[PDB]
């Protein structure tokens, strides 16, 4: 509702900036706010606007665009503000188009979300009826227009230069930089790209004042950040925390603790580009500077929490297989170097791995970290680097001991019956495909671990449930 939005102090930000303050002044204010990029870049955002306006253009036109694409699975962050309040979103590019001198722009939205795609077109239509988007904006000489672009959320397309090639209609081809997209972007003339969450606080900082935004948080990073929790958690939902939050407070008192009486081992943040944060650093703060020394990245703002029941090797390839199909394939590191590590632990999880290979991943670790072209490549071993610094020992349970204490790493376990609880009904023996179960009536059946495929069809075939992963 456009009338309910303007009753929430709606579009007051565009009224003041088009009548009082110069485009030079709005750049100086965000530098006083200390805002930096929340998309994962880590660069100061207002600094790139200085390059954007001051650059030389052959035709005098400049583009400004927005990033509304979500990369990490389960990271439901950008979609909520799209379905919650998109009027502040479209208001923000009009502030952005005022600062650098833009007349046209585009919005990139995924076609797989029927919730917000139909909603945002309604917002665009009503805004131009008031005169907000279009010509003669608030009786001024600045004209800015928009056109919706319907993407489908390709995971490799989230890269900055990939948005430019997406609207050009070619494949999602990341080109090397320099020249920068804020210097040579669409049609060889500068563009501006920012995430929706950056555009959220823009009407706030101009109305409330940037001194309040710098009043909350640490000295290095100012302001607040939003996350989207997930994993084995008691309570699922959305949280709004400021700068200054530690891990042990967020998992227990706010997160609701570990469900079903289990205990914490490690928590993954940042999706496939981040890493796993164990119990040893629960007292630590979360920050741009803090996590990069800890071996992770903020990512899309997700959170994956874990319990005892999962194998750390099993969660290790559970991220990288998602990125295996999502490489664009052009640099040889992110093309063939990625599958190199898959076949290593695949023999390990089956038990074909051999000694001396714990050091073997580290030479490939520094290579794809260094010579990767798009940002997927160097952050592909970011789970791999973190898991071997802190959790190095339990690989030898799979290398030497050939046991999986978690009980999900399948091809090396064993099944043991509990003769106290099991009656010996033999229902599991009939449903065993390998005929590896032997025994008689009223006596618990005995197992041959040599013949089992370890498919595990027998364990639920026991109504008593006395079969254990030994």
């Amino acid at each position: 509702n456009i009338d309910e939005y303007i009753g929430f102090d709606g579009y007051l930000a565009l009224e003041k900036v088009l009548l009082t303050m110069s485009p030079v002044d709005v750049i100086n204010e965000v530098k006083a706010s200390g805002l930096r990029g929340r998309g994962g870049g880590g660069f100061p955002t207002g600094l790139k606007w200085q390059f954007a306006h001051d650059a030389v253009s052959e035709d005098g036109i400049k583009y400004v665009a927005c990033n509304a694409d979500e990369g990490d699975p389960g990271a439901f962050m950008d979609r909520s503000v799209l379905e919650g309040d998109p009027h502040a979103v479209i208001e923000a590019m009009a502030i952005a188009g005022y600062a650098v001198g833009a007349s046209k722009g585009y919005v990139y939205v995924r076609a797989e979300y029927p919730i917000a795609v139909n909603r945002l077109q309604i917002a665009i239509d009503q805004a131009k009826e008031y005169g907000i988007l279009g010509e003669n904006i608030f009786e001024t000489d600045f004209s800015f227009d928009l056109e919706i672009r319907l993407g489908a959320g390709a995971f490799v397309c989230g890269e900055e230069t990939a948005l430019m090639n997406s609207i050009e209609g070619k494949r999602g081809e990341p080109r090397p930089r320099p020249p920068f997209p804020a210097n040579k972007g669409l049609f060889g003339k500068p563009t501006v790209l920012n995430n929706v969450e950056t555009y959220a606080n823009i009407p706030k900082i101009i109305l409330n004042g940037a001194e309040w935004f710098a009043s909350v948080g640490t000295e290095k990073s100012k302001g607040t950040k939003v996350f989207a929790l997930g994993g084995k958690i008691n309570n699922t939902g959305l949280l709004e925390i400021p700068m200054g939050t530690t891990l042990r407070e967020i998992i227990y008192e706010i997160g609701g603790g570990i469900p079903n009486g289990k205990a914490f081992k490690a928590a993954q943040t940042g999706g496939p580009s981040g890493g796993c944060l164990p119990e040893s650093l629960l007292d630590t703060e979360i920050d741009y500077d803090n996590l990069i020394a800890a071996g992770s990245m903020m990512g899309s703002g997700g959170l994956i929490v874990m319990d005892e029941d999962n194998c750390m090797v099993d969660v290790a390839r559970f991220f990288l297989d998602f990125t295996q199909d999502e490489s664009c394939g052009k640099c040889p590191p992110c093309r063939i170097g990625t599958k190199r590590m898959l076949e290593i632990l695949e023999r390990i999880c089956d038990g074909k791995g051999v000694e001396g290979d714990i050091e073997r991943l580290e030479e490939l670790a520094v290579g794809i970290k260094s010579s990767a072209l798009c940002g997927l490549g160097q952050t592909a071993p970011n789970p791999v680097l973190s898991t071997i610094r802190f959790f190095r020992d339990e690989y030898e349970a799979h290398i030497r001991d050939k046991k999986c204490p978690a009980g999900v790493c399948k091809h090396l376990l064993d099944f043991k019956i509990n003769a106290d609880t099991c009656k010996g009904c033999g229902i599991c023996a009939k449903k065993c495909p390998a005929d590896a179960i032997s025994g008689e009536k009223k006596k618990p059946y005995n197992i041959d671990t040599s013949k089992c495929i370890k498919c595990g069809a027998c364990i639920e075939a026991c109504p008593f449930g006395s079969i254990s992963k030994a």
């Binding site: 076609a111 489908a152 209609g169 070619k170 494949r171 069809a457």
Partner: protein, 129 residues
């Protein structure tokens, strides 16, 4: 939903191809329209729509092979969708696959499909005809 070859190729390609700007652009917008009402992307008709556009086939076929955002040819008459997500892999359906391999025909991946989780995880596995 799928009104065969002739009238739809004519109707949809004589209507919403002829615009300006969006160099491939809105062609991707009609590509999804094809999988909105064909279920596949035609082989010999990319050449027809391209000669209507006057641009060769390598870039559109490259767009087709680049994204996995749509489907291709293989459709005999029906499809058999076995739900094999993580919760469904806890349940498992391998003996059912072995069962159809000895009666119906070949293994997964060949016509005589693979599905992500669609909902209703409590009744795993799900057979989708």
């Amino acid at each position: 939903m799928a009104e065969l070859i002739p009238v739809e190729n004519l109707d949809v390609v004589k209507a919403i191809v002829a615009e300006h700007r969006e160099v491939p652009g809105c062609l991707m917008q009609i590509l999804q329209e094809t999988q909105l009402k064909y279920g596949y992307l035609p082989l010999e008709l990319q050449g027809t729509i391209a000669d209507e556009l006057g641009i060769p086939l390598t870039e559109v076929y490259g767009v087709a092979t680049f994204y996995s955002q749509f489907t291709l040819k293989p459709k005999g008459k029906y499809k058999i969708g076995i739900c094999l997500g993580t919760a469904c892999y806890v349940r498992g359906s391998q003996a059912i696959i072995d069962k159809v391999n000895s009666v119906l025909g070949t293994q997964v991946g060949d016509t005589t499909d693979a599905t992500r989780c669609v909902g209703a995880c409590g009744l795993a596995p799900v057979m989708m005809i």
